[PDB]
């Protein structure tokens, strides 16, 4: 059809990837500036990413797409930019912040996910840095979920989509299995977003000079500090809910519908409205969550 920079004017970049890009644009026509995403079609194929950001992009708390180009070798998706930095940091870095934002901010980010596991979606991919605000509002309204580069539509043989419920046609069990545990795999990494905000520290990491063999066997062990220190101001109900998303067994690992069905999300306005007592170590968190995720796509 037409071309990218006929409508908008490039600027700095936001994150550059081996496969993709993201830079800041603005819309010549408005002046509204957004974010565009570049994917070297020769290096990935950005259907399957682009064919969700399309149907589930209208979803409130995930970042939605405003326009898409494609001049034959890069295809550029202009998605809308985050005012509002990374979630976990930010929140990290106020130092009030009480126990029951936590139970706000996770329900919102825990109704999303729902969604896409019940419409066949996994985000495979799900760590902090892909959970930024759209502005500077605060209100959990200003989430968004994004980059869906790792995402995954659970499909049958004949390219047709499928839901968790119809299972009437054909879909291979080890193709469904795997569906089974990008679930799971997807509320681990949220069990560790909890974690964190909590207490102001990774379960599993300390900081970005953590080797991938440590890192791995931590998380091997299944067992976790959910006491002692910045615990011990904590309910014992949020307590619990960290345990049973960071369950080593998958199997034993609750959904994202269990988690929304826990007393912590339910009953949230019997939770403490005053500080919590974390570790101050905003940029320390970040290495470390950065080390771990690195450790598990090690082989990615
Ligand atoms: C690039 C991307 C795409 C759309 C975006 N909309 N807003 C932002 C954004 C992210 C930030 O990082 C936390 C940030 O803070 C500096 C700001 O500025 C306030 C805006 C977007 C970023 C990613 C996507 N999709 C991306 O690069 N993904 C990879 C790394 C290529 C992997 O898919």
Redesign the pocket.
């Known amino acids: 059809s037409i071309q990218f920079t006929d409508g908008y004017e490039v600027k700095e970049d936001?994150?550059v990837?081996s496969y993709?890009?993201?830079k800041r644009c603005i819309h010549k026509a408005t002046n509204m500036e957004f974010?565009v995403?570049i994917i070297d079609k020769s290096k990935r194929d950005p259907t399957e990413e682009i064919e969700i950001l399309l149907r589930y992009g209208q979803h409130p708390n995930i970042?939605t797409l405003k326009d898409v180009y494609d001049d034959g070798k890069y295809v550029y998706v202009v998605?809308?930019?985050?005012?509002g930095?990374?979630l976990l940091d930010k929140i990290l870095r106020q130092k009030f912040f009480s126990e029951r934002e936590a139970s706000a901010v996770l329900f919102t980010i825990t109704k999303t996910v729902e969604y896409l596991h019940a419409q066949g979606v996994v985000h495979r991919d799900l760590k902090p840095?892909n959970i930024?605000y759209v502005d500077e509002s605060g209100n959990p309204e200003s989430i968004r979920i994004?980059?869906f580069?790792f995402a995954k539509q659970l499909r049958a043989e004949n390219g047709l989509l499928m839901t968790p419920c119809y299972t009437a046609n054909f879909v291979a069990p080890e193709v469904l299995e795997r569906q089974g545990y990008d679930a799971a795999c997807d509320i681990w990494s949220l069990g560790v977003l909890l974690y964190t905000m909590l207490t102001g520290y990774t379960p599993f990491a300390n900081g970005p000079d953590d080797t991938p063999e440590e890192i791995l066997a931590r998380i091997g062990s299944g067992k976790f500090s959910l006491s002692g220190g910045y615990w011990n101001s904590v309910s014992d109900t949020a307590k619990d809910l960290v345990s049973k998303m960071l369950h080593v067994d998958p199997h034993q690992r609750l959904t994202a519908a269990l988690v929304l069905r826990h007393p912590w999300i339910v009953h949230w306005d019997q939770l403490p409205q005053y500080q919590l007592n974390r570790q101050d170590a905003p940029h320390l968190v970040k290495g470390a969550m950065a080390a771990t995720y690195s450790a598990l796509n090690r082989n990615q």
């Open positions: 936001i994150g990837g993709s890009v993201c974010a995403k970042i998605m809308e930019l985050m005012k930095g990374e840095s930024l994004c980059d580069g």
